[PDB]
Every structure is written in C-alpha cells, then in structure tokens.
Write an enzyme that holds these catalytic residues in place. Structure first.
Site, PDB file in Angstrom:
ATOM      1  CG  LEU A 121     -87.431 -52.948  32.599  1.00  0.00           C
ATOM      2  CD1 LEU A 121     -87.918 -53.412  31.237  1.00  0.00           C
ATOM      3  CD2 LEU A 121     -87.995 -53.826  33.689  1.00  0.00           C
TER       4      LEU A 121
ATOM      5  N   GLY B  99     -76.923 -49.470  31.046  1.00  0.00           N
ATOM      6  CA  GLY B  99     -75.585 -49.812  30.612  1.00  0.00           C
ATOM      7  C   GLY B  99     -74.796 -48.614  30.122  1.00  0.00           C
ATOM      8  CD  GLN B 100     -69.003 -48.404  27.912  1.00  0.00           C
ATOM      9  OE1 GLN B 100     -68.967 -49.056  26.859  1.00  0.00           O
ATOM     10  NE2 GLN B 100     -67.967 -48.335  28.754  1.00  0.00           N
ATOM     11  CG  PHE B 101     -73.401 -47.957  24.345  1.00  0.00           C
ATOM     12  CD1 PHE B 101     -72.706 -49.112  24.690  1.00  0.00           C
ATOM     13  CD2 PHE B 101     -72.732 -46.961  23.643  1.00  0.00           C
ATOM     14  CE1 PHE B 101     -71.376 -49.277  24.322  1.00  0.00           C
ATOM     15  CE2 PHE B 101     -71.400 -47.118  23.272  1.00  0.00           C
ATOM     16  CZ  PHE B 101     -70.722 -48.278  23.612  1.00  0.00           C
ATOM     17  N   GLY B 102     -77.059 -46.566  27.228  1.00  0.00           N
ATOM     18  CA  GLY B 102     -78.404 -46.082  27.473  1.00  0.00           C
ATOM     19  C   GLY B 102     -79.150 -46.921  28.498  1.00  0.00           C
TER      20      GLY B 102
ATOM     21  CB  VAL C 258     -83.996 -51.326  28.888  1.00  0.00           C
ATOM     22  CG1 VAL C 258     -85.256 -52.010  28.382  1.00  0.00           C
ATOM     23  CG2 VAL C 258     -82.860 -51.519  27.896  1.00  0.00           C
TER      24      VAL C 258
ATOM     25  CE  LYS D  32     -80.397 -50.875  23.732  1.00  0.00           C
ATOM     26  NZ  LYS D  32     -79.893 -52.262  23.810  1.00  0.00           N
TER      27      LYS D  32
ATOM     28  CG  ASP E 151     -73.422 -57.805  21.724  1.00  0.00           C
ATOM     29  OD1 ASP E 151     -72.765 -58.806  22.069  1.00  0.00           O
ATOM     30  OD2 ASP E 151     -73.513 -56.787  22.440  1.00  0.00           O
TER      31      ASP E 151
HETATM   32  C1  LIG Z   1     -81.579 -56.412  32.846  1.00  0.00           C
HETATM   33  N1  LIG Z   1     -82.123 -56.401  31.494  1.00  0.00           N
HETATM   34  C2  LIG Z   1     -82.366 -55.134  30.825  1.00  0.00           C
HETATM   35  C3  LIG Z   1     -83.865 -55.092  30.551  1.00  0.00           C
HETATM   36  C4  LIG Z   1     -84.424 -56.366  29.920  1.00  0.00           C
HETATM   37  N2  LIG Z   1     -85.124 -56.026  28.647  1.00  0.00           N
HETATM   38  C5  LIG Z   1     -84.544 -55.500  27.553  1.00  0.00           C
HETATM   39  C6  LIG Z   1     -85.498 -55.345  26.549  1.00  0.00           C
HETATM   40  C7  LIG Z   1     -85.193 -54.728  25.216  1.00  0.00           C
HETATM   41  C8  LIG Z   1     -83.933 -54.841  24.619  1.00  0.00           C
HETATM   42  C9  LIG Z   1     -83.675 -54.214  23.393  1.00  0.00           C
HETATM   43  C10 LIG Z   1     -84.663 -53.464  22.750  1.00  0.00           C
HETATM   44  O1  LIG Z   1     -84.443 -52.797  21.562  1.00  0.00           O
HETATM   45  C11 LIG Z   1     -84.136 -53.337  20.331  1.00  0.00           C
HETATM   46  C12 LIG Z   1     -84.685 -54.539  19.901  1.00  0.00           C
HETATM   47  C13 LIG Z   1     -84.368 -55.051  18.637  1.00  0.00           C
HETATM   48  C14 LIG Z   1     -83.512 -54.353  17.790  1.00  0.00           C
HETATM   49  C15 LIG Z   1     -82.965 -53.142  18.214  1.00  0.00           C
HETATM   50  C16 LIG Z   1     -83.281 -52.636  19.473  1.00  0.00           C
HETATM   51  C17 LIG Z   1     -85.896 -53.310  23.373  1.00  0.00           C
HETATM   52  C18 LIG Z   1     -86.151 -53.931  24.593  1.00  0.00           C
HETATM   53  C19 LIG Z   1     -86.718 -55.786  27.093  1.00  0.00           C
HETATM   54  C20 LIG Z   1     -88.045 -55.904  26.642  1.00  0.00           C
HETATM   55  N3  LIG Z   1     -88.439 -55.526  25.398  1.00  0.00           N
HETATM   56  N4  LIG Z   1     -88.985 -56.422  27.474  1.00  0.00           N
HETATM   57  C21 LIG Z   1     -88.671 -56.816  28.715  1.00  0.00           C
HETATM   58  N5  LIG Z   1     -87.416 -56.721  29.179  1.00  0.00           N
HETATM   59  C22 LIG Z   1     -86.429 -56.219  28.395  1.00  0.00           C
HETATM   60  C23 LIG Z   1     -83.309 -57.372  29.618  1.00  0.00           C
HETATM   61  C24 LIG Z   1     -82.387 -57.659  30.802  1.00  0.00           C
END
Ligand SMILES: CN1CCC(n2cc(-c3ccc(Oc4ccccc4)cc3)c3c(N)ncnc32)CC1
Ligand SMILES: [Ca+2]
Length: 430
Positions: free
Chosen positions: A185, A188-191, A193, A207, A298
């Site tokens: 999806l 970035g610079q840290f991992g 998704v 992630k 952030d």
């Molecule tokens: C281009 N882009 C990257 C993917 C997209 N993204 C990121 C996430 C995402 C971001 C952070 C994440 O991990 C944490 C969440 C809360 C605290 C710590 C980590 C899990 C999923 C995501 C999701 N859960 N469902 C659908 N889309 C998601 C956001 C915009």
C-alpha cells in the site's frame, strides 16, 4: 444459569468458536472478555462466541431501537448515515445524566437540512410530563403514531452494522506464518504497509518495520502500551510479530489515509460540515490520548486513517518515540520538546489540511523559509472556504507559548457542537 441471545449472524472462522444466526439463544458457560464460552440451544454445541454479539434475553439491548454506549454525538453521526430517513430514531444511554436514557430523532428543516434532535427521558418513564409510560416500548409505540410534541413522529429504528469480530483469543504475539501479505500500500524511509490476511479468513493491515536501531526489546515495551490505548477513533492494534523485521498488524482501513482521501474524487464532494465532523472525530481521538497522558508526535493527515463508513482513526501514536517540520511546533523544532501541546499545534495544521482538501501546508515555502517565517510571527492565512470561527481554533492552536494553546478536551467540545448552540443540545418539551 444465564441465557443470552444472538444480536447478529456470526460465522465460525477459528478452531473452537461457534456458528449462530440472529435470534439464537445460548447458555453462558464462562465469561472471559471478548470471547465467551457458550452452549447453543439450537445446535447444542459448546464453544466460543464474541461477547459483543450477544446480550441477556428480554434485556434492553435485544431491542432494535436501543443503542448501548452511544454518546450524543455518535447518535447524531449514526442517524445522519445513509439508509436512514425522517423519524429514524434511537433510544440510548444518557451521556450526561448517568443511568437515564435519551431519545435521538432524525429531523428536517429547510434552513439547515437534515438534523438530529435529542430528548431527555426521565425515570416508569416520560419525556413530556403530560404523558407517562410503563415501558420504553410504550413510549416508542406512542410517539410512533403521531408526534405528541416531538420534532418528528417516530418511523424506523436507526441503521446498525455488525461490530468488528474480536481478534483471536490470546494472540497478541503471532508467528509470521499466519500472514499472507498480498499488496503493498505504501513504502517509506522506515518500512512498508501491506494489505494482508491472517490465517486465511481475516483481512488486516501490516506495517513492516525496516530493521533499524529500533531495539527489538524497546519496541515491544512501547507496543504493549499501544495495545492498551483502545478507542474508537484510534486504529485497532491486533497483533505483532516479535522477530526482526517487525510486523505491526492492525485493522484494515478501507479508504486509506485522510490525505489521499481528501485529494480523491469522493473526498472532494465532502461539504464543510463533514470536514469539520472529521476534525471533531480526530479531536476526540486526541482528547483520549491527552486524557491518558500520552503523546502522538507525528499528527498530520498522512497518519489519520479513513474507514469505508467515513469514521476517522488515528495511526502511529507514539511510534516517533521509537523511530517533516511543517507540522511541528517551534519548541519541538528548536529544543526537541514534544508535549501534548506540541500536538495541538500539529492539530492546527491538520485542521488546515482538512479544510484545504489535503493541500500541502505553507505552499511554495521551504522548510527553512517556514522556520524563519514563524520566528517573525507569520501564520497561514484563512482560505476561501474556511469559516472565520474555525480559523480562530487554528490560530489558538498556533500560539508561541505552549500553555496558551487550548486542550483537546475543549477543542473536541467546540468542534462537536460547532453548528449547535449549547442551549439547543437537548429539546425541552412541556
Ligand atoms: C499511502 N498510504 C500508506 C498505506 C495506508 N495505510 C496505512 C495504514 C496503517 C498505518 C499504521 C499502522 O500501524 C500503527 C497503528 C497505530 C499505532 C502504531 C502503528 C497500521 C496501518 C493502513 C491501514 N491500517 N489500512 C488501510 N490503509 C492503511 C495509508 C496511506
Ligand atoms: Ca433547549
């Protein structure tokens, strides 16, 4: 001897849980959180059930018009959701008078459009003292035929949905093998998704962290704290893979980020009161984090997720402590002093991002140019579509002194009732 009834259909997807339909009665053998052990009265099978798909027989939550755990503002949002109409109603818990109930009804006046109006029900039960009822069904059955006083006569109960299924029993740490990461999806610079699948039958989001200086140990110390920050406007952390490279498994949010959403087709047809409703949700998320004495670090539209039903959720809370200045407060930039007050600042810029349909902050300005602009007291101007009173919140969020910045509590409360005067929160009826 306790007997519950199924509120929704549920299909078994684990080894030892039960399949049941709506209306199914079962016996509770054991209580233990999100999963309970039951005995189906229709199949006579002992097994596990999700404790939020059932409630005691004849009890209040068995009724179609009753909604447990809904704030006045949630009722407003659920009743303005597609599939409801004039008279769409719900009786729910009072958020202010604890132990009493409230009625929320979908109304229409040509000067504002669709609204939701709320009534206090008083302890026997009555709304109007003129008319008293023995049960809540009697109340409902009355105002269902004509509105003896109300803004609208009751039609159909509010549209509900299935709650999300609880994550598997004792499964905070999972083997990587359970995952099939199907689609990247973002990177970035840290991992990265990914959209993934957990044990063949549960869609999730993963992630993957790039194995940096983020200590294996030190991360789990912080992850086990994120597991405890469970709120409806914080993203749900389901599990974690403990072996480097680390995976973070969360709920899958259908519409991606707020930033990509505001910039899209469907995001561009969102009227201003929806943009504010979005902000309100986020301010509720931060008020919780603030309540819990915690720091995001952030806060911006790229770290806010949108669901298919348009509920806003906050992602990567805290991550920056374990691991971009246009969102960052001066004291944070200058002396590395990150507080909940530096978030409020970040919330001001996010506010602007929302109101500009995701436009980059300080357009045409460099990161250095921004820094020197701030030190001279420059701030972003009000755009065309921004109401003046919403600009004040931004400007209050952006005060040089951290202590002078409002709380997420106060901000939430302002944003929640932005179009409503305090006196109009509850309709009073003789
Ligand atoms: C281009 N882009 C990257 C993917 C997209 N993204 C990121 C996430 C995402 C971001 C952070 C994440 O991990 C944490 C969440 C809360 C605290 C710590 C980590 C899990 C999923 C995501 C999701 N859960 N469902 C659908 N889309 C998601 C956001 C915009
Ligand atoms: Ca009033």
């Amino acid at each position: 001897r306790i007997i519950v009834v199924a509120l929704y259909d549920y299909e078994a997807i684990h080894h030892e849980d039960l399949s049941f339909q709506k209306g199914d009665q079962m016996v509770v053998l054991e209580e233990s959180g999100e999963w309970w052990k039951a005995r189906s009265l229709a199949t006579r099978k002992e097994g596990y059930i999700p404790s939020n798909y059932v409630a005691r027989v004849d009890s209040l939550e068995t009724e179609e018009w009753f909604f447990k755990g809904i704030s006045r503002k949630d009722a407003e949002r659920q009743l303005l959701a597609p599939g409801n109409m004039l008279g769409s109603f719900m009786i729910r818990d009072s958020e202010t008078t604890k132990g009493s109930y409230s009625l929320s009804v979908r109304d229409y006046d040509p000067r504002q459009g669709d609204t939701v109006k709320h009534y206090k029900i008083r302890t026997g039960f009555y709304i109007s003292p003129r008319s008293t009822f023995s049960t809540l069904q009697e109340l409902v059955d009355h105002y269902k035929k004509g509105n003896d006083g109300l803004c609208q006569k009751l039609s159909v109960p509010c549209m509900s949905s299935k709650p999300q299924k609880p994550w598997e029993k004792d499964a905070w740490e999972i083997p990587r093998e359970s995952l099939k990461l199907e689609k990247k999806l973002g990177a970035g610079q840290f991992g990265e998704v990914w959209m993934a699948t957990y044990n063949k039958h549960t869609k999730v989001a993963v992630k993957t962290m790039k194995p940096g200086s983020m200590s294996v140990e030190a991360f789990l110390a912080e992850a086990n704290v994120m597991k405890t920050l469970q709120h409806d406007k914080l993203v749900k952390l389901h599990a974690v893979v403990t072996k480097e490279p680390i995976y973070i498994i969360t709920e899958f949010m259908a519409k991606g980020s707020l930033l990509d959403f505001l910039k899209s087709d469907e995001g561009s047809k969102q009227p201003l009161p929806k943009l504010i409703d979005f902000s309100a949700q986020i301010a509720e998320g931060m008020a919780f984090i603030e309540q819990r004495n915690y720091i995001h670090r952030d806060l911006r539209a790229a770290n806010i997720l949108v669901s298919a039903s348009l509920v806003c959720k906050i992602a990567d809370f805290g991550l920056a402590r374990v691991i971009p200045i246009k969102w960052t407060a001066p004291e944070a930039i200058n002396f590395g002093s990150f507080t909940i007050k530096s978030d409020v600042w970040s919330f001001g810029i996010l506010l602007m991002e929302i109101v500009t349909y995701g436009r980059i902050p300080y357009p045409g300005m460099s990161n250095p140019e921004v820094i020197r602009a701030l030190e001279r007291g420059y701030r972003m101007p009000r755009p065309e579509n921004c109401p003046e009173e919403l600009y004040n919140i931004m400007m209050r969020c952006w005060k040089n002194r951290p202590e002078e910045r409002p709380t997420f509590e106060y901000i939430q409360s302002v944003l929640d009732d932005f179009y409503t005067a305090t006196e109009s929160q509850y309709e009073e009826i003789p």
